UniProtKB/Swiss-Prot annotation, chain B:
Residues 40-106 form the Importin N-terminal domain. Residues 405-408 are annotated as: Necessary for HTLV-1 Rex multimerization. The lineage of its organism: Eukaryota, Metazoa, Chordata, Craniata, Vertebrata. Changing F548A: Partially abolishes Ran binding activity and does not abolish nuclear export complex formation. Abolishes Ran binding activity and nuclear export complex formation. Abolishes Ran binding activity and nuclear export complex formation. Expressed in heart, brain, placenta, lung, liver, skeletal muscle, pancreas, spleen, thymus, prostate, testis, ovary, small intestine, colon and peripheral blood leukocytes. Not expressed in the kidney. This is Exportin-1. Its main location: cytoplasm. Disulfide bonds: none annotated. One of its GO terms (molecular function) is RNA binding. Residues 1-673 are annotated as: Necessary for HTLV-1 Rex-mediated mRNA export. It comes from Homo sapiens. Found in a U snRNA export complex with PHAX/RNUXA, NCBP1/CBP80, NCBP2/CBP20, RAN, XPO1 and m7G-capped RNA. Component of a nuclear export receptor complex composed of KPNB1, RAN, SNUPN and XPO1. Found in a trimeric export complex with SNUPN, RAN and XPO1. Found in a nuclear export complex with RANBP3 and RAN. Found in a 60S ribosomal subunit export complex with NMD3, RAN, XPO1. Interacts with DDX3X, NMD3, NUP42, NUP88, NUP214, RANBP3 and TERT. Interacts with NEMF (via its N-terminus). Interacts with the monomeric form of BIRC5/survivin deacetylated at 'Lys-129'. Belongs to the exportin family. The gene is XPO1. Pfam families: CRM1_C, CRM1_repeat, CRM1_repeat_2, CRM1_repeat_3, IBN_N, Xpo1.
From Swiss-Prot, chain D:
GTPase involved in nucleocytoplasmic transport, participating both to the import and the export from the nucleus of proteins and RNAs. Switches between a cytoplasmic GDP- and a nuclear GTP-bound state by nucleotide exchange and GTP hydrolysis. Nuclear import receptors such as importin beta bind their substrates only in the absence of GTP-bound RAN and release them upon direct interaction with GTP-bound RAN, while export receptors behave in the opposite way. It comes from Homo sapiens (Human). The record marks L62 as: Essential for GTP hydrolysis. This is GTP-binding nuclear protein Ran. Changing K30R: Decreased acetylation. The lineage of its organism: Eukaryota, Metazoa, Chordata, Craniata, Vertebrata. The gene is RAN.
Amino acid sequence: PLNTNIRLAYSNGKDDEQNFIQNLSLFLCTFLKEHDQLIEKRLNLRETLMEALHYMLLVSEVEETEIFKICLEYWNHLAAELYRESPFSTSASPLLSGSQHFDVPPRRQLYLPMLFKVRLLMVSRMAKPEEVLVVENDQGEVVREFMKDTDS
Amino acid sequence: MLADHAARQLLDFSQKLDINLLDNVVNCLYHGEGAQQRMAQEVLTHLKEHPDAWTRVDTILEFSQNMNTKYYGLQILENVIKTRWKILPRNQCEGIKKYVVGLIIKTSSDPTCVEKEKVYIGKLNMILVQILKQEWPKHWPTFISDIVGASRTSESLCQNNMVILKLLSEEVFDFSSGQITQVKSKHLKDSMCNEFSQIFQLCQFVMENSQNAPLVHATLETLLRFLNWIPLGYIFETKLISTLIYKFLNVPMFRNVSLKCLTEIAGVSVSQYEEQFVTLFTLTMMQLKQMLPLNTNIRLAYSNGKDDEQNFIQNLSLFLCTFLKEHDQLIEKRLNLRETLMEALHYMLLVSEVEETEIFKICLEYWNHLAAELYRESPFSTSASPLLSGSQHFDVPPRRQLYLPMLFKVRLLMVSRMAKPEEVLVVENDQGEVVREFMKDTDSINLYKNMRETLVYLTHLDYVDTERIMTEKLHNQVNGTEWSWKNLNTLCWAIGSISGAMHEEDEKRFLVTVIKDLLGLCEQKRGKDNKAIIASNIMYIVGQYPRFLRAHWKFLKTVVNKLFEFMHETHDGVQDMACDTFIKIAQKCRRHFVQVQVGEVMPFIDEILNNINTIICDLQPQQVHTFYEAVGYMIGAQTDQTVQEHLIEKYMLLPNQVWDSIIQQATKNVDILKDPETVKQLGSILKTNVRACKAVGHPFVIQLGRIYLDMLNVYKCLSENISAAIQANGEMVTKQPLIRSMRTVKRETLKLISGWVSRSNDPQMVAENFVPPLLDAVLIDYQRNVPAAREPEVLSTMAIIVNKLGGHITAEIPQIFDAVFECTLNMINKDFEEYPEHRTNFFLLLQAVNSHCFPAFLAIPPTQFKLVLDSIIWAFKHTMRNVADTGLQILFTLLQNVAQEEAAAQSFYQTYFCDILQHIFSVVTDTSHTAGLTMHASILAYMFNLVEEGKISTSLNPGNPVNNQIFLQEYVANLLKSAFPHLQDAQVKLFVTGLFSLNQDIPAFKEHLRDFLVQIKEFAGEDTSDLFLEEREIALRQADEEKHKRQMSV
Amino acid sequence: DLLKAVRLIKFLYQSNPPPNPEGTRQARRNRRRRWRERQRQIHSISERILSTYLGRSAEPVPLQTVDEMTKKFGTLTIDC
Amino acid sequence: QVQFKLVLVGDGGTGKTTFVKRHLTGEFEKKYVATLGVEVHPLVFHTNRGPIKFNVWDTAGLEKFGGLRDGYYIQAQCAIIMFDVTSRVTYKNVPNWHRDLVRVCENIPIVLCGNKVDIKDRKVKAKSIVFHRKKNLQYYDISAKSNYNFEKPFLWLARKLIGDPNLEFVAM
């Protein structure tokens, strides 16, 4: 059910449930990435589409880095696919010109109910920007090393 | 299991009562039913009223085994103490006092009885409180010290002594008014204050040293009651606050009482203890966070909590509300406390989510106080200084930033828990019709109004954040994350609530966005249920924002067209919604409906009129009436008299057609009036007519004059038809649907008459053309009608006419009374319960006539006038409070009118004044009319004043040219002595003297009358010590000096 | 008296229908900089109109870079 | 059978007898037959958890007919203090009834009911109805004529007594 706490289920669920949630994230990411253009134009499916988005949000809350990576991959694909044809239209969204802001491409309109949700999810679960390690070289010197291009 | 004679046998006081028999009687009372229980009640009431019953009470207590019988005996003892303590022999008084004290001590010695007989112990404590009120401090000033010593001797004795002290404090301060004279209460309060120090020391000793938790709780309770009045020095200059917070606030067994005490303290608004308050807060929060972590889900705790936990949460909310409302300025200036302040506010948020109306009410009260202060500060800048995107932040007055981190959560709370703006019930009137009634000024409506005011203030502070919040929750609905009918309805109610809080352009844009999103949602959803929900929400929202509609004709036209499209819908609620929104839009945009709109050559009303029939094919009669009301509002906006006339003609064309057809049919034969279908058609037509009159008003006259005469005949043709049927089967036939519809048509006719009359503006024409037909058609019919057939709404209806016509109707007043008066009076002059509607409407008519047709009273025969006065005296003797207040207001207005008529004033006084005094005093001495007390004194002070001011030039006793004052004094003294022989003469003399002295301090007059009533309840012996006669005499002479100073200054 | 200044500001906001973002990243850089100069001009006009009669309320806005500094200083940890 | 002792108290001529009759028969009494002492009426409801019985002790609201007065309150299991919103005095008298009631039943669920809210001219505005807050009484607006919140007091009392907050009245 869409109203369940997916994060709590994952924390308290067994291996089967966690694997099922991971596979759900996988399927949603893949299918949406490959067929958002198809699903978007069909109005009767819109509500269903939104449910999918709902799922990913709850999934993004899981206390697992891999699941959040998958969700972030999906959201990043959305943002990229959201090619800002006129970012000045965004700048027009404030009390500046209206009509240009109302020229917002249809897809951005369809996802409006979710853009702020993704924003909040990012802000809530942003990862550490820089990782520093206490490294003891062969000479016994304790230094701080700035890891680079790690997974984090 | 006992016969009335057998029960009365116990009333033989020369024989020993069978205690087992009384136990049987009481067990039957508390477990028997019907005749047995009623008999037991009656017998016990009679016995308790017996004078010498107390002679057995002592013997009862020593032998009684049933605590209930002991309670009844103690009730008898309480009556005796409250009646005759100044008349009882001193020896017996002291003996029984020792008896009761010893019994209290013995009961306190047994813990089992303490738990078992708590009610009995409490009754004993109250009996002792009454005893001491009669005696203390005079005859037992040494009591308090002894008992505190005794308290120190035993923990249970200390507990009971604190309980008795609590009861004493309650009786002296909280519940003294109405039971104790002013002076006796003042003396008792002074004595209590003087001796309080011992009590305070004892309670502090108990708090610091006692470990008996029940004893501690009793101590806290007694302290709680003391907190009502005790001097502040005892509160804030000791370890009390710290002791409570540290020893007891963390104890669940004591947290409730402690926090109640703390709330009472918080309500003290004085600067002399500023710092103390701060400490009180600082520690309290420190304790709260230990007991109640800020991360706890208060809503879940409550819903899953027990009685004690929920009461504690409510007490916490109350304490926070009081303390913050009284000390926000104090806490603001201390930066180091800022964090703690937030914690308090944090709690309220967590509290505000609880699923209890009262807790949310308390929270709303505090939030509205905050919003009021902030909207008294901010608008000076924000309103009277232009703003830009984000410019609100720069101009911020300092005080707002303090609470700024919480304003958005307050906004979320409001938009999430908004209550329904309006409550409607389906109610079955007496006529069997189930109709929709719009509640007014109910608790919930006040809740919504408070929430709306708070949210509007917050919007004025930061409208952009609020708009973002509604938009965000609207998206949450669109995405289906927060999808539910309740949530959408709450959101839409909130959106509507704030109409007018935003600038025109911002509200326009917000409405455009909201509506576009809503229509997208409607296209999105599947299922007629949700689609109808959304449509209804949209209609309500647009109705709540009529400004936008006025600015955009095309949208208005489209909305109304869609509404008519909906009106054909059969699904539940759609039609009622559409009609409600239609009437709202009509009320708010009539001008735009009748004013020729750009792009249209005729007002939309023409198309509406042409398409009425098509519109109504699928509508219910109630919906038809509501639609007609809407159109009437639109029609009333018209200004051109002839155009309005034609519009009304076309407007009532279909009801007029049906009415004319039925009139012709009746002309053919009158038996059709018994056609139930025809009567229902008349009911619908007449409901339509009354709605149209209410909406349009005085122009409706042209419509009314079309049918008036005929309609009146119908009423007569109806009225007679009823009587025979009643004569055929009595009142039972009234229960038949046919008779009910007959009465319904009658009532609707009367309602139409009243509705048009109230709003008329040409009284001459109304009186000349419309009254005489009513005189013949109904009034003569009304007298001709049998009582049970007479319709009370007639009476009140006539009142409304005179209420509007005043002098213009005076000439016709006599005929009315000779038609209706005695038959009405003869119908109500036998008791005070039958035909309440007739009583009330009759007295309403009397009040209107007195207010506006006094010369009619000047023109009637004196016998009629005396009948009127006797009827009035019957009136303010009624138990029906409405009737009593109406009668008293009539009497006061009549006295003022008499004062306006110099010639007849003296004659009226001579004729009626002493009888009026007798009657008013008989009522006042009756406790059942205490609710009218405020009015009683109002006239008495006036009446007595008239005597004192010499305006009564003639001697009320023409055989003796004595001062009216002296004669009245003696007359009143004799009257009271006759009614109350047992009273002391000094009491009555002082009372009368004050009555003259107090004729210009109305609250003092009222308290004087209350003191006299209290005296009446007591058998006062020669012992005047408790009466403080000299003290009250000094106060009354001072008040007389003040009154004479007012007179010299005037 | 005040609503008119607000409508004026909202118009001046609405009277600049940004630029049209077309071209290479350097031509688009130049359009970004031109639109930024336009925003600068709009803000200058708004602030000067504020100075006309509203300045008594919003004057500190540029000056907040000294009060924020007095707040950045005084970070004293005199206790715990 | 799952019956409780309920004591109805309040100023006389406010509707106590009216309310009890309306719940028993269903008809709405018009006249005020001033009560004498107390009348005991059984009253039945069908909640989701079965039948329920209130032993309504509709007591006289006039002192002259007080009779046993507080004696009736003995063994009371729940209490409904009721007043009229059109007469301020009938509210100001409320604390007296509350004190008398509490003096016998220290800890019992108590509902303050404002009868006949239907009448247009309300005197005791909800803004001023605050006495319940401090005392932890559960407040309710009712109207025996318009049937508004007719069962709300009894439903709340049953929920408190039985302990089932989700317990709900069923028609049959």
